[PDB]
Amino acid sequence: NDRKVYVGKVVSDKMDKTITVLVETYKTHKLYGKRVKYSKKYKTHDENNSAKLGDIVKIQETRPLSATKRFRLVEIVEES
C-alpha cells in the first residue's frame, strides 16, 4: 500500500516557504450529470523552492512533518 503521485500547479506564496500545490480531478455530480471540472487546495512545502510563478509539480500523502501542512513531493513538469 503505497503513496500516490498527486500533482498540480501553484498560485502564490509568502515568507520562507509557505509553499503549496494545486489539486484537481475529473469527476461529476450524482444529480444532473455534466462534465464540469473541479478543484480544491493543498499544503506542501520546501526550503523556499516549490513556490509561485510556475511550479507545476507532484505532491504526496505521507507524514507531513509540518504545522498543518501535509506533503513531501515535487515531481515536476517544467519551469518558466
Partner: protein
C-alpha cells in the same frame, strides 16, 4: 430544458400547503410554543355553542359549535348531522378536518367520545351521530 445551468441553478417542486395548520397541535404553557404533532386523537372543551343563519346552498336551518382549543385563540367547529346536542363544557375525541360546506372550521366530534353518547333518535345509522349496541 438544458442541463448546464441546472447544477449551476436548480429548479423547484410545486407549491402546496398541507391541511388544518392550526390543528394537529398542542399549545405549551411551560415553554409557551406549540407542538407539531399530527396526533391521532385529542380533546375538545367548550366555550360557547354558536350559530349563523345565512345558508344559501342548503336553505334549511342548523347550528354549529364554537369550541376553544388551548390557551387563548379562536377555534371553531360544526356539528354535521340531524342530532342536536344542547350541551357544552365537554371533554371529547376530536375529529380532524372540515366536512363539506363550512369555511375555516376543521374540528369535530366522534360518536360517543367520553362526553355524551349521541342523538339517541338514531337506531338505523348504527354508525352516525351516536349509535352504540345496534342490532345488525
Amino acid at each position: 430544458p438544458t442541463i448546464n445551468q441546472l447544477v449551476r441553478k436548480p429548479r423547484q417542486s410545486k407549491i402546496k400547503k398541507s391541511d388544518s395548520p392550526a390543528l394537529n397541535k398542542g399549545f405549551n404553557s411551560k415553554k409557551k410554543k406549540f407542538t407539531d404533532l399530527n396526533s391521532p386523537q385529542k380533546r375538545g372543551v367548550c366555550t360557547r355553542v354558536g350559530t349563523m343563519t345565512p345558508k344559501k346552498p342548503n336553505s334549511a336551518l342548523r347550528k354549529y359549535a364554537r369550541v376553544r382549543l388551548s390557551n387563548n385563540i379562536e377555534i371553531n367547529a360544526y356539528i354535521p348531522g340531524i342530532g342536536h346536542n344542547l350541551q357544552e363544557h365537554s371533554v371529547v375525541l376530536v375529529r380532524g378536518g372540515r366536512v363539506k360546506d363550512l369555511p375555516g372550521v376543521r374540528y369535530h366530534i366522534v360518536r360517543g367520545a367520553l362526553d355524551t353518547s349521541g342523538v339517541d333518535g338514531r337506531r338505523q345509522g348504527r354508525s352516525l351521530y351516536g349509535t352504540k349496541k345496534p342490532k345488525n
